[PDB]
Amino acid sequence: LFKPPKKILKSAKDLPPDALIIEYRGKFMLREQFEANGYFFKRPYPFVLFYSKFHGLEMCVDARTFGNEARFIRRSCTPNAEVRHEIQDGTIHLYIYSIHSIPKGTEITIAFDFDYGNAKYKV
């Protein structure tokens, strides 16, 4: 369970590891759609989540449109949560899960999803 007091998403309760926290809702686009709409893929637009872990198929969720409190989640190199996917009725949904236990009143963060650090390589 979560809570947002910019606004910051925070654990409402001492969550256990691997706990479903919140769905990242918004408009789903493949990379090509995002680029056709005029935006650059994996550059840090506010309220946009980039996700590449569904079998290498690059997509994003634009939460300027009917998003929820999940759009407020900040990125961190030391995150306590992660984006996971599931298929429901042939539609992909993205959810934020805890990576380990999260004390109540701790900010919920996920790993950087956009091109940060200006690196030559990545792991």
Author numbering: 24 to 28, 37 to 154
Paste lines from the article.
Full-length MLL5 is a 205 kDa protein (1858 residues), although a smaller isoform (around 75 kDa) including a single Plant HomeoDomain (PHD) and a Su(var)3-9, Enhancer of zeste, Trithorax (SET) domain has been described. Even if a hallmark of SET domain-containing proteins is the histone methyltransferase (HMT) activity, it remains controversial whether the human and mouse MLL5 SET domains possess a catalytic HMT activity. To better understand the molecular mechanism of human MLL5 function, we solved the crystal structure of its SET domain at 2.1 Å resolution. Accordingly, biochemical and biophysical experiments showed that the SET domain of MLL5 is devoid of any binding activity towards histone peptides or the cofactor S-Adenosyl Methionine (SAM) in vitro and does not exhibit HMT activity on full-length histones.
